[PDB]
Design a protein around this ligand. Sequence first.
Ligand SMILES: Nc1ncnc2c1ncn2[C@@H]1O[C@H](COP(=O)(O)OP(=O)(O)OP(=O)(O)O)[C@@H](O)[C@H]1O
Ligand SMILES: Nc1ncnc2c1ncn2[C@@H]1O[C@H](COP(=O)(O)OP(=O)(O)OP(=O)(O)O)[C@@H](O)[C@H]1O
Ligand SMILES: Nc1ncnc2c1ncn2[C@@H]1O[C@H](COP(=O)(O)OP(=O)(O)OP(=O)(O)O)[C@@H](O)[C@H]1O
Ligand SMILES: [Mg+2]
Ligand SMILES: [Mg+2]
Ligand SMILES: [Mg+2]
Lengths: 559, 262, 24
Amino acid sequence: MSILDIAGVDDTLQRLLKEVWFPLRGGEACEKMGYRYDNGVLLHGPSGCGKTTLAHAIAGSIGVAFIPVSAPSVIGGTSGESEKNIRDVFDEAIRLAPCLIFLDQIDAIAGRRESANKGMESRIVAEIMNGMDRIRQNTPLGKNVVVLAATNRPEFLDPAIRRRFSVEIDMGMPSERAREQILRSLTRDLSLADDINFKELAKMTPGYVGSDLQYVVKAAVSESFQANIDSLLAQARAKHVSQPQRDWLLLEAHRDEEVSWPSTKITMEQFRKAVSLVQPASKREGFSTIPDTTWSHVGALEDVRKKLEMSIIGPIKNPELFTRVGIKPAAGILLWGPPGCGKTLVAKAVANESKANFISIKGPELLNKYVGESERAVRQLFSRAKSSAPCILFFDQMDALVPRRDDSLSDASARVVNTLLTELDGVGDRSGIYVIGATNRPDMIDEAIRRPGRLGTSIYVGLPSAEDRVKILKTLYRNTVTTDADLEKVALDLRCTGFSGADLGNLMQAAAQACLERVYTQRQQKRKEGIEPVITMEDWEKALNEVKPSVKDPEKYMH
Amino acid sequence: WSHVGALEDVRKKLEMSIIGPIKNPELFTRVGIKPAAGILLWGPPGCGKTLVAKAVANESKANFISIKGPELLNKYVGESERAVRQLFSRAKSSAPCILFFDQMDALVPRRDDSLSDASARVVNTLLTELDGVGDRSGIYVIGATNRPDMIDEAIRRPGRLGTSIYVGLPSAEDRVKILKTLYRNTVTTDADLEKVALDLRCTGFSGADLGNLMQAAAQACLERVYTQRQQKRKEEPVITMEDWEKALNEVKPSVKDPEKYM
Amino acid sequence: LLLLLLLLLLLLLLLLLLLLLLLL
Ligand SMILES: Nc1ncnc2c1ncn2[C@@H]1O[C@H](COP(=O)(O)OP(=O)(O)OP(=O)(O)O)[C@@H](O)[C@H]1O
Ligand SMILES: Nc1ncnc2c1ncn2[C@@H]1O[C@H](COP(=O)(O)OP(=O)(O)OP(=O)(O)O)[C@@H](O)[C@H]1O
Ligand SMILES: Nc1ncnc2c1ncn2[C@@H]1O[C@H](COP(=O)(O)OP(=O)(O)OP(=O)(O)O)[C@@H](O)[C@H]1O
Ligand SMILES: [Mg+2]
Ligand SMILES: [Mg+2]
Ligand SMILES: [Mg+2]
């Protein structure tokens, strides 16, 4: 199916009112001018964007003869049967004019014949051209035939067939306003709890298509009936191998008895839980899992945290506020400094606190041995990020992916640098893509990469001060379990001079090992002759005399 | 061209070489000018090479094919050069057409003994397409690169890329035009925008630095709004002149050695 | 007799380009 079953597309439905409805339903108007209005409409877009449902929705809204055709169904085993089946499709449409043909998945049979290394395949393409031309000529005046074709790979079509479609409609991924309309059309026959905020649901589904939104509704429905299965398991558990295995066995036993499920409404909490259970089709591959690191894991670094909130977390959460002042929805951050001071840690909190999509690149991970496959990976990297905006791209140890372009530089590694130059700031737009780079050698990064629009801001993450080492040590200790007065003394000790965040974590590890040695020796004495492993202040003394700083030349990275 | 500030000389050369003959082919044919141009835009990064190539592609009302660096390269034998040959076939059949090769040094490096054969066969293919036996009239080629000296010397000859236009750092009075252009398209008045752009802390700023300066000023506005809004709750943002003062302190030029790109 | 359309195989064997590395 029905015109209400298709939603989120309004420009598309406006065109089809004069390119599909008018030729088929306004037949008399065309006959006044003596004009043969035989039209051909090609629908293309991402898979799941309601191309098949749009064709069937508008095929019941017109009422003319409709011929649904699937491309594999017109293939036969006989020598001439395959081409005869296609011929009968267009012959029946002329006999039933006005009529609407839907050639779904037309790219399966109408592929390029320069690469279709067969005889049937080339004659199938030629038969479609002849069929689409008989419609324009063999139909009576005033009885037009419209051919609808849907394919998510329009580039595979033969150019001699693609030119026969006067109208091409690109059904892209739904926008935020469009996703709200689709959700309403999917839940219009369900019983909702009157508190469903479709504005919030559309805002929390940045990279979803119509099929993905159907899964959210499908997942939310199962939430409502989840409580009606626990009540069913209670009737079976109390009637008479882990718990999940018992459920599959108790329900198997009562395979001849059924209990009516009470009708329930779907609340807003179920919908918000359903969104988390559904992964978008565009998120199936290429995306990393969100790190568990939060701001509670990051001690000190208040200056760094404030810069990352204004540059990334801010515009992601409320882009409306940042748009008014004139800030583009795209940031490029270069974190640099001595090793172990929290560059990767603070970039995993941003990936987690912003609640956006995350892709992490491990240095030169995109390099490939073939000529074009390393630059293609970079181009594909920004295609997935753009399609699932907002997204955070994190390049860990980025100096290995964008080395400074010199004569001595390899030609193959200079193409990757120039590929990233165009992806970050070129002709195409990367709005909604936020890039974070972490490196120890900011001077080994190409100077064109380090410019506003590609990586505008450089944030220096250096060695902690004496006051900062207290915040870091408390953060490390409380996230792994002495009190706090002793931690201040341990962190402020002159033996901790030059310690980084990784050294304080190593200092705590050396304190725990000293605790275990103390436990080992005392346990034997109080078991043979005659406990609780807890890090005492005496254990911290052993660690302070054992752990040495790791950044031995701080000024080598401070430059 | 309303998005482009300063660059008056660069606009004239692009209007005479590309925009001119596209709109009035008869006038340029009369004096004996071939209906095809090759232009190499070079200079330090962030100075507007891609910006003016996007203005030419839009103000000329011609067909546009954009090539983003070495995106034509394929791992199979002959497919990388087939894409280049197919690229010019499309441009010729839809003339007048503008081909923009962004970051062109990645597609036509100098033919050395260490360049391998896969990338040397693409340079030679681009040599024949730009000037060979075949006819490529009606195809206007623009290239942008930060490293003009790393391009093959055969490519940079009259017939393939005849003219090189240097898009360098803005002057003191050019930054005023660029800053006003950036601010006008993203809405302080105009007397204050002159003070910001003429400030000595803006020395060496490119076009991207002035855009970053305006973004830093905008971010400083939201910090001021947050502090005031919280105070009113406890006890329409506009980029004021005090925001530009602290934006001029936290923004540095992104071209450290401009002479290295000259 | 009836003539039938049959599906078959191919040899193809495309050749791919490679990138190498050199010493100092
Ligand atoms: N705009 C939309 N409005 C309502 N429902 C939609 C919309 N887009 C998709 N859907 C739903 O999601 C599913 C989309 O499947 P459909 O067959 O329409 O996809 P398609 O565009 O034909 O793609 P492909 O066949 O290439 O996978 C259906 O269940 C349909 O109900
Ligand atoms: N500011 C900090 N607060 C809390 N823990 C910290 C901090 N800095 C470092 N750490 C701890 O030390 C570890 C250091 O690892 P991290 O990945 O942050 O180093 P890095 O700055 O990325 O350096 P490198 O360049 O060597 O990768 C962290 O995983 C965390 O356990
Ligand atoms: N003359 C100018 N007038 C207005 N805005 C400008 C000007 N020059 C630069 N900008 C702004 O700064 C940006 C600089 O990016 P652009 O793509 O123009 O760089 P480029 O000159 O090609 O150098 P790169 O080698 O870094 O790509 C522009 O997109 C625009 O926002
Ligand atoms: Mg379909
Ligand atoms: Mg790290
Ligand atoms: Mg550019």
